[PDB]
Amino acid sequence: SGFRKMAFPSGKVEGCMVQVTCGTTTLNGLWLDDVVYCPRHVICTSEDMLNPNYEDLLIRKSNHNFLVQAGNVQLRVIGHSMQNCVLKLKVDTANPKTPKYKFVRIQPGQTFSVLACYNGSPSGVYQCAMRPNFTIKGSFLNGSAGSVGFNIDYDCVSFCYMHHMELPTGVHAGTDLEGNFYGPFVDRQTAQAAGTDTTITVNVLAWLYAAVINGDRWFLNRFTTTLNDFNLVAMKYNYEPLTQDHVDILGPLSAQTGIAVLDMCASLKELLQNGMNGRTILGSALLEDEFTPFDVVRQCKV
Amino acid sequence: SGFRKMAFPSGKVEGCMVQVTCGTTTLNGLWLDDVVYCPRHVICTSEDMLNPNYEDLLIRKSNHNFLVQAGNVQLRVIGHSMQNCVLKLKVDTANPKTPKYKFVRIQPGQTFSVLACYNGSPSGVYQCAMRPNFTIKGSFLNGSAGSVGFNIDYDCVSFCYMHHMELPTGVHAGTDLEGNFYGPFVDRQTAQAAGTDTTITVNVLAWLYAAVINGDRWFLNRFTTTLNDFNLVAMKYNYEPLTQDHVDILGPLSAQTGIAVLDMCASLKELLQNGMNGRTILGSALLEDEFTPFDVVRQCKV
C-alpha cells in the first residue's frame, strides 16, 4: 500500500534528448527517427524576443547554423522547417534509440511526467497536470525549454508537452509536439498572464478514492447529494463542474470501494465547507488534484 | 521557478531490473555485471512466514530452482549465495547495460529515487527520504520487493535501498545492497513496529529556503537564535537536532537568499510555536521534511 506522486520511468525519453544551439542560444531538442523537434525561439537572439518575425528569422538561417549534439555525437542538420511554434530539424541520422511513440494533445486535468533537461542532458523527472487554465505548475530553470512531458503505455511513449516559457506568476506554458500552444499563450514577449485557475474536481474525487483504498476514510459520511447540489457548492469554491462523464469515469473506483460517486461528492462537499479540522488525507493537509482516476487505478492495481 | 518532488532520470537503473522466480514466488532483482541481487525471501513458501530459517530454505534450492528473466531473455543461474538478507545469483552473462555504480548505506534524513517495479518491469519513479525511524513512506504492492532506491552523481548510480516489506502501519522497510536492513526490522511476517518518527530539521530548513527562492517570504522575521537555543525548541517538538555541519550544508542556500541559517532557525521556531494560521508555504499546509539541502540546490541554483 501507500500512494505517491509517481512519474513514468524516463529511460525511453532520455535517449531522445539532444542539445540544439543557434548562435549563442541553446536549449533542448527531442530526436525521433531522423527529426529533431525544438522550440522555434532558439533562432532568436537578445535583440529578437520583442516581436520575432519567426518566418523571416528561419529563412535567413541555413542548416549549418543549427548545432545539434546528442551527447557528444554531432548530428548534421539537412533541413529545417516550421511546425507551428516548434521547429523540425531534419538530420542525416535516425535516432537508434527511438521508442515506439505518438504525439497526443492532452486535455486539462490530465497528468503526465516531465523530464527536465538542460543542455540536452536530463536532470530530473516529475509528475504534473495540465491545469484548467492551460498552464502547468512545473519546476524549470533557464535552459529547460525543449524539455518534454509524456505518458507511457506498454512501452509506447505518448509525448504531450514541450516546454517553452515561464509566465510572470512562475507557472509554465508550452506546446504539444505538433507545436500548438496549450492555452492562449504565444512565444513572444508580451504582458500575457495565466487566467484564473480552478481545482480539478474529478481528480480530487479520485484521490479520495485512493485514500479509501489505502485505509484512510475518516471523511466518509452518511450524506448523499445530487449532482447539481454538489456542483453549486463546487462553483462557490472554484472547483470545476463534475459531469456525468466524470461520474462514469469514477465507476471502477466506486465499484472497488463500494462508495457511490455521489456519496464521495457529499464527502468532498463537507471537506470544502468545514475543512479538515487538523486532519490529513494520504499525508496531505490540503485536497490534492493532480491524480487522475487512471493514475489511482494504475498505482493501486486491484 | 517552481518546486517539485523530483526523482533522478531512471534509465540507467531500468536497464538493470530483472525478474526472479522461485516456485510460485516472483519479485525483482538487480543485474549488475554477472550478478543478480534480490531479496532472500524469494525462496519462501507458505509455511515459512512466521520464522523462516533461511539457511535451511537456501540449502533446499539449486541454481535451476531460480528462474531469472531480463526482458525476454532467460538468464542461466550458474551460482547462488546469501549475504545477510539478499541473494547473489551468479549468471552466465554480464549485463551490457551495467552503469557505473556503487553501493552505499544512506544516512537517516537523506533522500533517494525509487524505481518501483513488478515482474522485472519498471512501473514508476518517485522520491523517498530515509526516515529517522528507518522506514520509508513509499508506494509498494505485492511483487515490488527487489525494487531499488538510488541517487545519481556524474553518471555514477549510487544504489542505497532494496525494498523488502511493508510494516503493519503501511510504511516500508528494506536493506542496503549488502542486505543489511535499515532499522531493527527482519524479513519475516511478525508483529514489528517502528519507533515514533521525528521530523528532519535540516530538511525543513532547506524547504523554507526553497520557499523563499520561490517568492514565499511571509514566515521570515528579525529574530535570530543560537544553535543551542533552537535545539531546545527542536527537542520539544520532536525535531532532530541541528548540527554545525547542517548549518554548513545550508550555506549555499543562505547565500542565494540572503537569510542567515540561524535566522531561518528563528523563523522555524516561530512556525512551530504558532503554526501557519491557514497560510501555505510552497503550496503546503504542513512543514515538509523530505527535501535535503542538495535536493533544493539541484532544483533552484541559478
Numbering used by the authors:
A (entry chain A), B (entry chain B): 1 to 302
Reproduce passages from the article.
The main protease of SARS-CoV-2 (Mpro, also referred to as 3-chymotrypsin-like protease or 3CLpro) is responsible for the majority of nsp processing, cleaving at 11 conserved sites along the polyprotein including self-excision of Mpro by autolytic cleavage of its own N-terminal and C-terminal autoprocessing sites. SARS-CoV-2 Mpro is a functional homodimer of two symmetrically disposed protomers that are each 306 residues in length (33.8 kDa). The active site of Mpro features a Cys145-His41 catalytic dyad, which orchestrates nucleophilic attack at the carbonyl carbon of the invariant P1 glutamine and the formation of an acyl enzyme intermediate central to efficient peptide cleavage. Using C-terminally substituted Mpro chimeras, we have determined X-ray crystallographic structures of Mpro in complex with 10 of its 11 viral cleavage sites, bound at full occupancy intermolecularly in trans, within the active site of either the native enzyme and/or a catalytic mutant (C145A).
Cleavage site C8 has crystallized with the same approximate unit cell dimensions and relative Mpro dimer orientation in the crystal lattice as that of the earlier structure for C5; however, the C8 crystallographic data is defined by the space group P212121 with four protomer molecules in the asymmetric unit (ASU) compared to space group C2 and two molecules for C5. C4, C6 (form 1 - see below for definition) and C12 also share a general relative disposition of Mpro dimers in the crystal packing but C4 and C6 have higher symmetry belonging to space group P22121 with three molecules in the ASU with the symmetry generated dimer contributing its C-terminus to one of the active sites of the non-crystallographic dimer. By far the most conserved residue at the P2 position though, in both viral and recently identified mammalian cleavage sites, is leucine, present in all of our collective of structures with the exception of C5 (phenylalanine) and C6 (valine). P2 valine, unique to cleavage site C6, also maintains a highly analogous set of interactions with a markedly similar S2 pocket, but with a less optimal vdW interaction surface as a result of the gap from the static pocket edge to the shorter beta-branched side chain of the P2(Val) C6 variant. Gln189 is more extended and forms a single hydrogen bond between side chain Oε1 and main chain NH of P2(Leu), an interaction common to all Leu/Val P2 substrates.
